[PDB]
Design an enzyme around this catalytic site. Structure first.
Site, mmCIF file in Angstrom:
data_model
loop_
_atom_site.group_PDB
_atom_site.id
_atom_site.type_symbol
_atom_site.label_atom_id
_atom_site.label_comp_id
_atom_site.label_asym_id
_atom_site.label_seq_id
_atom_site.Cartn_x
_atom_site.Cartn_y
_atom_site.Cartn_z
ATOM 1 N N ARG A 187 0.834 -1.195 0.000
ATOM 2 C CA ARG A 187 0.000 0.000 0.000
ATOM 3 C C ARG A 187 0.867 1.241 0.000
ATOM 4 O O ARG A 187 2.081 1.165 0.166
ATOM 5 C CB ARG A 187 -0.908 0.060 1.238
ATOM 6 C CG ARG A 187 -2.111 -0.874 1.244
ATOM 7 C CD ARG A 187 -3.267 -0.231 2.007
ATOM 8 N NE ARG A 187 -3.718 0.982 1.320
ATOM 9 C CZ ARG A 187 -4.586 1.862 1.812
ATOM 10 N NH1 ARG A 187 -5.119 1.687 3.014
ATOM 11 N NH2 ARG A 187 -4.930 2.922 1.088
ATOM 12 N N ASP A 229 -3.517 -0.658 8.844
ATOM 13 C CA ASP A 229 -2.536 0.394 9.113
ATOM 14 C C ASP A 229 -1.656 0.204 10.337
ATOM 15 O O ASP A 229 -1.464 1.129 11.133
ATOM 16 C CB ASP A 229 -3.247 1.737 9.212
ATOM 17 C CG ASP A 229 -4.087 2.037 7.997
ATOM 18 O OD1 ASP A 229 -3.674 1.654 6.879
ATOM 19 O OD2 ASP A 229 -5.154 2.664 8.162
ATOM 20 N N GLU A 263 -4.322 13.988 4.599
ATOM 21 C CA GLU A 263 -3.208 13.777 3.680
ATOM 22 C C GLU A 263 -3.337 14.808 2.575
ATOM 23 O O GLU A 263 -4.446 15.180 2.195
ATOM 24 C CB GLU A 263 -3.276 12.390 3.064
ATOM 25 C CG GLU A 263 -3.270 11.277 4.084
ATOM 26 C CD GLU A 263 -3.758 9.976 3.497
ATOM 27 O OE1 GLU A 263 -4.670 10.031 2.644
ATOM 28 O OE2 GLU A 263 -3.250 8.908 3.897
ATOM 29 N N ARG A 309 -6.935 16.043 1.243
ATOM 30 C CA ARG A 309 -7.981 15.031 1.378
ATOM 31 C C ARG A 309 -8.927 15.536 2.458
ATOM 32 O O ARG A 309 -8.482 15.965 3.525
ATOM 33 C CB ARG A 309 -7.375 13.691 1.804
ATOM 34 C CG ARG A 309 -8.379 12.688 2.377
ATOM 35 C CD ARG A 309 -7.695 11.360 2.665
ATOM 36 N NE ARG A 309 -8.548 10.435 3.402
ATOM 37 C CZ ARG A 309 -8.196 9.195 3.729
ATOM 38 N NH1 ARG A 309 -7.005 8.727 3.375
ATOM 39 N NH2 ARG A 309 -9.028 8.426 4.422
HETATM 40 C C1 LIG Z 1 -0.712 6.411 9.453
HETATM 41 C C2 LIG Z 1 -1.854 5.911 8.842
HETATM 42 O O1 LIG Z 1 -2.753 5.189 9.565
HETATM 43 N N1 LIG Z 1 -2.061 6.132 7.547
HETATM 44 C C3 LIG Z 1 -3.238 5.618 6.828
HETATM 45 C C4 LIG Z 1 -4.288 6.727 6.725
HETATM 46 C C5 LIG Z 1 -4.861 7.085 8.097
HETATM 47 O O2 LIG Z 1 -5.295 5.896 8.765
HETATM 48 C C6 LIG Z 1 -6.037 8.053 7.952
HETATM 49 O O3 LIG Z 1 -5.624 9.196 7.198
HETATM 50 C C7 LIG Z 1 -6.553 8.500 9.322
HETATM 51 O O4 LIG Z 1 -7.715 9.315 9.149
HETATM 52 O O5 LIG Z 1 -5.314 6.431 5.764
HETATM 53 C C8 LIG Z 1 -5.353 5.065 5.332
HETATM 54 O O6 LIG Z 1 -5.637 4.215 6.447
HETATM 55 C C9 LIG Z 1 -6.486 4.945 4.309
HETATM 56 O O7 LIG Z 1 -7.457 5.719 4.446
HETATM 57 O O8 LIG Z 1 -6.353 4.083 3.412
HETATM 58 C C10 LIG Z 1 -4.042 4.628 4.668
HETATM 59 C C11 LIG Z 1 -2.837 5.213 5.409
HETATM 60 O O9 LIG Z 1 -1.775 4.255 5.452
#
Ligand SMILES: CC(=O)N[C@H]1[C@H]([C@H](O)[C@H](O)CO)O[C@@](O)(C(=O)O)C[C@@H]1O
Length: 474
Positions: free
Chosen positions: A28, A53, A328, A344
């Site tokens: 991912r 995650d 993000e 986002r």
């Molecule tokens: C550090 C981390 O968890 N990054 C993850 C984020 C956060 O969980 C969200 O931005 C929280 O709101 O988003 C994802 O999970 C997603 O939406 O696919 C992928 C990404 O790897």
């Protein structure tokens, strides 16, 4: 003639919940970087145990020296070892997750900045209470170690020697200069010459020490075009404020300003949460930057700082407003010097902030573009010139959900305003995170998340397209 190449799978996930050929279930978070040498570096999260995650996740890359036609073997930047004693392996590993790549055009150094969490569920397992992670002593900042039963903070000093809260050296030492492949020995805790455990382990510990349970930011760099990487550097103390709960990168590819008073500045998208509403109503975008070629980093201000929301001012450190969040993001500098931050969010459409000072502060007008839908997923955008005209190419899911990848084209005027011209599909079916790069000669490349035939989320694939694909209709 419109041209779009067939998709080429760069990081292949397993299928039906099974591991792939290398025993890895998922990949991912793509990052695509075209280096000075013309090399394409494809970065990603190598999620071994599952697609969530957290867990056992390594920061890896693959290099292509023929503009995306063929790719070399995987190169691991960092991959911390698992806690062999954790009761639940799915959440039993210190975590690295989400990477941003960028190259300094002058020094040619390539940077990979990514998140780090000690053993746990990552952003979804953060404590309600803060734990100081660093302590300043004699004008020196040292990372803290906690020992159950003692309130005082031990510290990791020169050579990794552990010092008591009262400032006395102990016979314990931390591996602060890792040497094993992937630096899997970083954090190892020794007592004399015996390995006892690891400071990143949080459960069923076999050693007495652990760092603070918090969100961290690490950085690794390469001076040989991505072939080899430095041991991780913890840059958290340079940019994380005392009120911040989560502080992580907006994955993808950062930029280096090309013009204006801040030319040369490296910008890295990031976002934070506060202790008031955390993930429910405080996710706020901003950037961290470096004006000295990556030696030191500094935090800019949040787009949400002093932002007017319903006749009321908010701040990223105290806000509790779901719709005012921005998470993000992808960053672009325009020819007029302005910096645009595509974030986002939860408005259903594209949200863009503008900075007139190299990314430090953001103007009051957060623009929304109904022309570009946002299903609440990462996106990437890049600046590009074509026949003397300035444009921005942005890619993200077209919806309804995380599906139907789109590449949006916008004309950029001298005032920095955007006019969306085209919206062309690039990948049917599942589509999520992506990373765009201009390849030159009027061509562009994109590394994105997609699945089909039962593949685990996600398989990261690559495609190349030209101006005929962007402008002309399919
Ligand atoms: C550090 C981390 O968890 N990054 C993850 C984020 C956060 O969980 C969200 O931005 C929280 O709101 O988003 C994802 O999970 C997603 O939406 O696919 C992928 C990404 O790897």
């Amino acid at each position: 003639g419109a041209a779009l190449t067939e998709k080429t799978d760069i990081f292949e996930s397993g299928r039906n919940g099974k591991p792939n050929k290398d025993g890895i279930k998922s990949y991912r978070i793509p990052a695509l970087l075209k280096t000075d040498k013309g090399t394409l570096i494809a970065g990603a999260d190598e999620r071994r145990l599952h697609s969530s995650d957290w867990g056992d996740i390594g920061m890896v890359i693959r290099r292509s020296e023929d503009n995306g036609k063929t790719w070399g073997d995987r190169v691991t930047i960092t991959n911390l070892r698992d806690n062999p004693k954790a009761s639940d392996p799915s959440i039993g590993s210190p975590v690295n997750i989400d990477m941003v790549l960028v190259q300094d055009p002058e020094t040619k150094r390539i940077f990979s900045i990514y998140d780090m969490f000690p053993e746990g569920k990552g952003i979804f397992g953060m404590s309600s209470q803060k734990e100081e992670a660093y302590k300043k002593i004699d004008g020196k900042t040292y990372q803290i170690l906690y020992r159950e039963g003692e309130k005082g903070a031990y510290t990791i000093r020169e050579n990794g020697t552990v010092y008591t809260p009262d400032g006395k050296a102990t016979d314990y030492r931390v591996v602060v200069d890792p040497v094993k492949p992937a630096y899997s020995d970083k954090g190892d805790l020794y007592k004399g010459n015996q390995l006892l455990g690891n400071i990143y382990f949080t459960t069923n510990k076999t050693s007495p020490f652990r760092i603070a349970k918090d969100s961290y930011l690490w950085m690794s760099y390469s001076d040989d075009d991505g072939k080899t990487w430095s041991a991780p550097q913890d840059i958290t103390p340079m940019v994380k404020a005392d009120w911040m709960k989560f502080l992580g990168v907006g994955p993808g590819t950062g930029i280096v300003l090309r013009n204006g008073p801040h030319k040369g500045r490296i910008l890295i998208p990031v976002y934070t949460t506060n202790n008031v509403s955390h993930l429910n109503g405080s996710q706020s975008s901003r950037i961290i930057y470096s004006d000295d070629h990556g030696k030191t980093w500094h935090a800019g201000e949040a787009v949400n700082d002093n932002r007017q929301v319903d006749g009321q001012k908010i701040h990223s450190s105290t806000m509790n407003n779901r719709r005012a969040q921005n998470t993000e993001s992808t960053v672009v500098q325009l020819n007029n010097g302005d910096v645009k931050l595509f974030m986002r969010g939860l408005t259903g459409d594209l949200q863009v902030a503008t900075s007139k000072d190299g990314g430090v502060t953001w103007e009051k007008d957060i623009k929304r573009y109904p022309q570009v839908k946002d299903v609440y997923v990462q996106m990437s955008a890049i600046h590009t010139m074509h026949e003397g005209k300035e444009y921005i190419i942005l890619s993200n899911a077209g919806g309804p959900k995380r599906e139907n990848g789109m590449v949006h084209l916008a004309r950029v005027e001298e005032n920095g305003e955007l006019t969306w011209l085209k919206h062309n599909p690039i990948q049917k079916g599942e589509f999520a995170y992506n990373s765009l790069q201009e390849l030159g000669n009027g061509e562009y490349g994109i590394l994105y998340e997609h699945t089909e035939k039962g593949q685990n989320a996600y398989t990261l694939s690559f495609r190349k397209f030209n101006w005929d694909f962007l402008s002309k209709d399919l």
